[PDB]
């Protein structure tokens, strides 16, 4: 990847199971006679991570963006390998089984998917504002689901009905057609720039998405595409 970066071309580098890289380092150190550190891990854990992750950076001539996959042993995030991996992370994406099984193909959970770029001084005031209005109605994970479950929605929830409708609309709208799955699901893929995303979600939270039922925000690129589908 660094060859092409030196050529000036932006590169997307995927590392599958960087935790396995940590484990390989641990085994190499154990076989090399080095004393173990923490839970049997190599003493040179931080430096070994630095010598690899620091090459993934954006210089002036080019950039190497990385999208790694991390496997945590059991569910222990206190483990030294996930901790050292996370010390070199800028964003996390948490694909969820429930979202995947609800026919929404991009299973990126709106919650549990953070980023350090999501602040006004880089993305912009509007982007941060729209990203905060969304994920706020979902901040509860629609905790209203339990009250519906044990109350039959109580036959009336006032505003909660509107916030539930908006949250469901946004959850459906997060899906996007895949240009690589176009030959599988028979649907052209739409590429949505960040400006289109922020404008569409700003309008949806303002309320232009209202008066439109579900299954119309299921699988579309822009809010303009949703409007075109609605009028047709």
């Amino acid at each position: 990847a660094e060859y092409f970066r030196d050529e000036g071309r932006d590169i997307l580098l995927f590392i599958d199971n960087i935790f396995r890289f940590v484990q390989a380092g641990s085994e190499v150190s154990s076989l090399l006679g080095r004393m173990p550190s923490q839970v049997g891990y190599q003493p040179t854990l931080g430096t070994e991570m630095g010598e690899l992750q620091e090459r993934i950076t954006s210089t002036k001539r080019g950039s190497i963006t990385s999208m790694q996959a991390v496997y945590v042993p059991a569910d222990d995030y206190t483990d030294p390998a996930p901790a050292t991996v996370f010390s070199h992370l800028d964003a996390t994406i948490s694909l969820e089984r429930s979202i995947a099984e609800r026919a929404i193909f991009p299973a990126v959970d709106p919650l549990a998917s953070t980023s350090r770029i999501l602040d006004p001084n880089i993305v912009g005031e509007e982007h941060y504002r729209v990203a905060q209005e969304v994920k706020r109605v979902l901040q509860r994970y629609k905790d209203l689901k339990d009250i519906i479950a044990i109350l039959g929605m109580e036959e009336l929830s006032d505003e909660d009905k509107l916030t539930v409708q908006r949250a469901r609309k946004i959850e459906l709208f997060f899906s996007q057609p895949f240009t690589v799955a176009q030959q599988f699901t028979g649907r052209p893929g739409k590429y949505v720039p960040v400006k289109k995303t922020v404008e569409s979600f700003a309008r949806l939270l303002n309320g232009e998405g209202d008066h439109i039922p579900e299954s119309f925000f299921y699988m579309q690129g822009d809010f303009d595409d949703v409007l075109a589908a609605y009028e047709a």
Binding site: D146, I147, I150, L151
Partner: protein, 59 residues
């Protein structure tokens, strides 16, 4: 001869409040609902919910 008692089942018109100027009765139900019926019915249901859901999680 000395005291009069009216065990009336219900009272309606009352020059004290009547329909116009009536205040006590106004929001009186909420005064005996938000902390009694309305909201509180859900308020105690939320206690049942969040407690029940964590009851299996501790098992």
């Amino acid at each position: 001869p000395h005291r009069v008692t009216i065990l009336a089942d219900t009272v309606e018109r009352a020059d004290e409040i009547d329909e116009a100027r009536a205040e006590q009765a106004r929001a009186e139900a909420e005064a005996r609902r938000r902390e009694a019926q309305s909201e509180r019915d859900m308020a105690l249901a939320e206690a049942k919910l969040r407690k029940e859901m964590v009851r299996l999680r501790v098992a």
